[PDB]
Design a protein around this motif. Structure first.
Motif, PDB file in Angstrom:
ATOM      1  N   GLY A   1     -15.986  18.195  25.965  1.00 42.41           N
ATOM      2  CA  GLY A   1     -16.257  19.234  24.981  1.00 42.41           C
ATOM      3  C   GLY A   1     -16.971  18.666  23.772  1.00 42.41           C
ATOM      4  N   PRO A   2     -17.582  19.501  22.896  1.00 40.95           N
ATOM      5  CA  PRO A   2     -18.649  20.520  22.940  1.00 40.95           C
ATOM      6  C   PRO A   2     -20.003  19.778  23.039  1.00 40.95           C
ATOM      7  CG  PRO A   2     -17.633  20.327  20.744  1.00 40.95           C
ATOM      8  CD  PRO A   2     -16.698  19.724  21.738  1.00 40.95           C
ATOM      9  N   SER A   3     -20.988  20.330  23.750  1.00 42.67           N
ATOM     10  CA  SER A   3     -22.230  19.591  24.014  1.00 42.67           C
ATOM     11  C   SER A   3     -23.151  19.477  22.782  1.00 42.67           C
ATOM     12  CB  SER A   3     -22.983  20.177  25.219  1.00 42.67           C
ATOM     13  OG  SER A   3     -23.471  19.154  26.080  1.00 42.67           O
ATOM     14  N   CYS A   4     -22.956  20.366  21.800  1.00 47.30           N
ATOM     15  CA  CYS A   4     -23.781  20.402  20.579  1.00 47.30           C
ATOM     16  C   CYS A   4     -22.997  20.601  19.272  1.00 47.30           C
ATOM     17  CB  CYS A   4     -24.863  21.480  20.700  1.00 47.30           C
ATOM     18  SG  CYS A   4     -25.733  21.842  19.163  1.00 47.30           S
ATOM     19  N   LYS A   5     -23.069  19.605  18.398  1.00 45.97           N
ATOM     20  CA  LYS A   5     -22.264  19.577  17.182  1.00 45.97           C
ATOM     21  C   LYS A   5     -22.634  20.627  16.130  1.00 45.97           C
ATOM     22  N   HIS A   6     -23.857  21.139  16.191  1.00 47.04           N
ATOM     23  CA  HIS A   6     -24.434  21.866  15.058  1.00 47.04           C
ATOM     24  C   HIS A   6     -23.993  23.320  14.968  1.00 47.04           C
ATOM     25  CE1 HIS A   6     -27.397  18.533  14.438  1.00 47.04           C
ATOM     26  NE2 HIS A   6     -27.164  18.381  15.732  1.00 47.04           N
ATOM     27  N   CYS A   7     -23.916  23.968  16.119  1.00 48.22           N
ATOM     28  CA  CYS A   7     -23.439  25.333  16.155  1.00 48.22           C
ATOM     29  C   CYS A   7     -22.070  25.352  16.846  1.00 48.22           C
ATOM     30  CB  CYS A   7     -24.442  26.203  16.887  1.00 48.22           C
ATOM     31  SG  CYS A   7     -24.636  25.669  18.559  1.00 48.22           S
ATOM     32  N   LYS A   8     -21.758  24.249  17.530  1.00 43.95           N
ATOM     33  CA  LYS A   8     -20.489  24.073  18.227  1.00 43.95           C
ATOM     34  C   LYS A   8     -20.399  25.135  19.294  1.00 43.95           C
ATOM     35  N   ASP A   9     -21.497  25.272  20.021  1.00 45.77           N
ATOM     36  CA  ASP A   9     -21.521  26.113  21.198  1.00 45.77           C
ATOM     37  C   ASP A   9     -21.068  27.553  20.926  1.00 45.77           C
ATOM     38  OD1 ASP A   9     -21.124  23.247  21.424  1.00 45.77           O
ATOM     39  OD2 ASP A   9     -21.203  23.508  23.603  1.00 45.77           O
ATOM     40  N   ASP A  10     -20.893  27.905  19.655  1.00 43.25           N
ATOM     41  CA  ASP A  10     -20.535  29.269  19.272  1.00 43.25           C
ATOM     42  C   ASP A  10     -21.653  30.273  19.571  1.00 43.25           C
ATOM     43  OD1 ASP A  10     -19.943  31.695  18.164  1.00 43.25           O
ATOM     44  OD2 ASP A  10     -19.449  30.948  16.165  1.00 43.25           O
ATOM     45  N   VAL A  11     -21.704  30.731  20.810  1.00 41.89           N
ATOM     46  CA  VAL A  11     -22.749  31.632  21.242  1.00 41.89           C
ATOM     47  C   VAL A  11     -23.036  32.773  20.255  1.00 41.89           C
ATOM     48  CG1 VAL A  11     -20.985  32.856  22.419  1.00 41.89           C
ATOM     49  CG2 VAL A  11     -23.384  33.258  22.978  1.00 41.89           C
ATOM     50  N   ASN A  12     -22.102  33.046  19.349  1.00 41.68           N
ATOM     51  CA  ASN A  12     -22.306  34.112  18.367  1.00 41.68           C
ATOM     52  C   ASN A  12     -23.094  33.699  17.142  1.00 41.68           C
ATOM     53  OD1 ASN A  12     -20.418  36.534  19.343  1.00 41.68           O
ATOM     54  ND2 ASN A  12     -21.401  37.042  17.382  1.00 41.68           N
ATOM     55  N   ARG A  13     -23.356  32.397  17.054  1.00 45.11           N
ATOM     56  CA  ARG A  13     -24.198  31.814  16.015  1.00 45.11           C
ATOM     57  C   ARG A  13     -25.511  31.368  16.641  1.00 45.11           C
ATOM     58  NH1 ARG A  13     -21.821  33.349  11.645  1.00 45.11           N
ATOM     59  NH2 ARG A  13     -20.147  32.061  10.717  1.00 45.11           N
ATOM     60  N   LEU A  14     -26.538  31.229  15.806  1.00 40.60           N
ATOM     61  CA  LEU A  14     -27.831  30.719  16.254  1.00 40.60           C
ATOM     62  C   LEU A  14     -27.926  29.202  16.178  1.00 40.60           C
ATOM     63  CD1 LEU A  14     -29.903  33.217  14.269  1.00 40.60           C
ATOM     64  CD2 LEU A  14     -29.685  33.311  16.734  1.00 40.60           C
ATOM     65  N   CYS A  15     -28.832  28.624  16.945  1.00 41.54           N
ATOM     66  CA  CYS A  15     -29.014  27.200  16.821  1.00 41.54           C
ATOM     67  C   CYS A  15     -30.398  26.748  17.273  1.00 41.54           C
ATOM     68  CB  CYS A  15     -27.897  26.438  17.531  1.00 41.54           C
ATOM     69  SG  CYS A  15     -27.995  24.662  17.249  1.00 41.54           S
ATOM     70  N   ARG A  16     -31.122  26.138  16.343  1.00 38.90           N
ATOM     71  CA  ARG A  16     -32.474  25.671  16.589  1.00 38.90           C
ATOM     72  C   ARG A  16     -32.443  24.297  17.225  1.00 38.90           C
ATOM     73  NH1 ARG A  16     -32.955  28.780  12.852  1.00 38.90           N
ATOM     74  NH2 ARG A  16     -34.462  29.041  11.151  1.00 38.90           N
ATOM     75  N   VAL A  17     -31.288  23.659  17.132  1.00 34.25           N
ATOM     76  CA  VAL A  17     -31.130  22.315  17.652  1.00 34.25           C
ATOM     77  C   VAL A  17     -30.846  22.369  19.152  1.00 34.25           C
ATOM     78  CG1 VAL A  17     -29.811  20.220  17.486  1.00 34.25           C
ATOM     79  CG2 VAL A  17     -30.230  21.624  15.450  1.00 34.25           C
ATOM     80  N   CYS A  18     -29.905  23.220  19.560  1.00 34.20           N
ATOM     81  CA  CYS A  18     -29.583  23.303  20.988  1.00 34.20           C
ATOM     82  C   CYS A  18     -30.289  24.452  21.705  1.00 34.20           C
ATOM     83  CB  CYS A  18     -28.072  23.301  21.257  1.00 34.20           C
ATOM     84  SG  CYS A  18     -27.182  24.622  20.476  1.00 34.20           S
ATOM     85  N   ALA A  19     -30.575  25.529  20.962  1.00 37.74           N
ATOM     86  CA  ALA A  19     -31.261  26.718  21.491  1.00 37.74           C
ATOM     87  C   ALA A  19     -32.758  26.753  21.157  1.00 37.74           C
ATOM     88  CB  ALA A  19     -30.581  28.008  20.984  1.00 37.74           C
ATOM     89  N   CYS A  20     -33.322  27.964  21.142  1.00 39.33           N
ATOM     90  CA  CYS A  20     -34.728  28.101  20.793  1.00 39.33           C
ATOM     91  C   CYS A  20     -34.955  27.536  19.408  1.00 39.33           C
ATOM     92  CB  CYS A  20     -35.192  29.551  20.826  1.00 39.33           C
ATOM     93  SG  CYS A  20     -36.958  29.674  20.524  1.00 39.33           S
ATOM     94  N   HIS A  21     -35.774  26.496  19.310  1.00 38.90           N
ATOM     95  CA  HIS A  21     -35.937  25.824  18.021  1.00 38.90           C
ATOM     96  C   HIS A  21     -36.632  26.676  16.957  1.00 38.90           C
ATOM     97  CE1 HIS A  21     -35.870  22.998  14.912  1.00 38.90           C
ATOM     98  NE2 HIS A  21     -36.982  22.339  15.176  1.00 38.90           N
ATOM     99  N   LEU A  22     -37.123  27.847  17.333  1.00 38.20           N
ATOM    100  CA  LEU A  22     -37.746  28.733  16.353  1.00 38.20           C
ATOM    101  C   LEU A  22     -36.886  29.955  15.986  1.00 38.20           C
ATOM    102  CD1 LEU A  22     -41.345  29.080  17.807  1.00 38.20           C
ATOM    103  CD2 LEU A  22     -40.566  27.195  16.381  1.00 38.20           C
ATOM    104  N   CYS A  23     -36.279  30.623  16.961  1.00 41.30           N
ATOM    105  CA  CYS A  23     -35.486  31.797  16.610  1.00 41.30           C
ATOM    106  C   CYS A  23     -34.027  31.415  16.689  1.00 41.30           C
ATOM    107  CB  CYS A  23     -35.802  32.992  17.510  1.00 41.30           C
ATOM    108  SG  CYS A  23     -35.400  32.691  19.183  1.00 41.30           S
ATOM    109  N   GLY A  24     -33.786  30.277  17.327  1.00 47.20           N
ATOM    110  CA  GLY A  24     -32.444  29.756  17.489  1.00 47.20           C
ATOM    111  C   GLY A  24     -31.595  30.624  18.383  1.00 47.20           C
ATOM    112  N   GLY A  25     -32.244  31.514  19.129  1.00 47.14           N
ATOM    113  CA  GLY A  25     -31.546  32.370  20.063  1.00 47.14           C
ATOM    114  C   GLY A  25     -31.376  31.729  21.428  1.00 47.14           C
ATOM    115  N   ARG A  26     -30.283  32.063  22.109  1.00 43.35           N
ATOM    116  CA  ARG A  26     -29.971  31.413  23.377  1.00 43.35           C
ATOM    117  C   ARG A  26     -30.453  32.147  24.644  1.00 43.35           C
ATOM    118  NH1 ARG A  26     -25.775  28.015  21.212  1.00 43.35           N
ATOM    119  NH2 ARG A  26     -24.947  28.886  19.251  1.00 43.35           N
TER     120      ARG A  26
END
Ligand code: ZN
Ligand code: ZN
Ligand code: ZN
Ligand code: ZN
Length: 65
Positions: A1-26
């Motif tokens: 556990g968890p693969s990404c520290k920045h959003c902490k895999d919280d699918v309800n939050r956005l993340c440019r680091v683990c997700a789309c680096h521009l909209c941060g959407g998954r």
């Protein structure tokens, strides 16, 4: 556990680091690009210009690179 520290895999939050680096959407992984030398991911449609479809040249490089 968890693969990404920045959003902490919280699918309800956005993340440019683990997700789309521009909209941060998954959404739409099929439609995301991994820049081989930046390693972040990009929605083909978030790009500029945006791409109607994925490239065939299976080795892509982001606009940050
Ligand atoms: Zn994250
Ligand atoms: Zn996006
Ligand atoms: Zn890149
Ligand atoms: Zn950036």
């Amino acid at each position: 556990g968890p693969s990404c520290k920045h959003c902490k895999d919280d699918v309800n939050r956005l993340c440019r680091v683990c997700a789309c680096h521009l909209c941060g959407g998954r959404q739409d992984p099929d439609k995301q690009l991994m820049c081989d030398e930046c390693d972040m991911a990009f929605h083909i449609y978030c790009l500029d210009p945006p791409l109607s479809s994925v490239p065939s040249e299976d080795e892509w490089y982001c606009p940050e690179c």
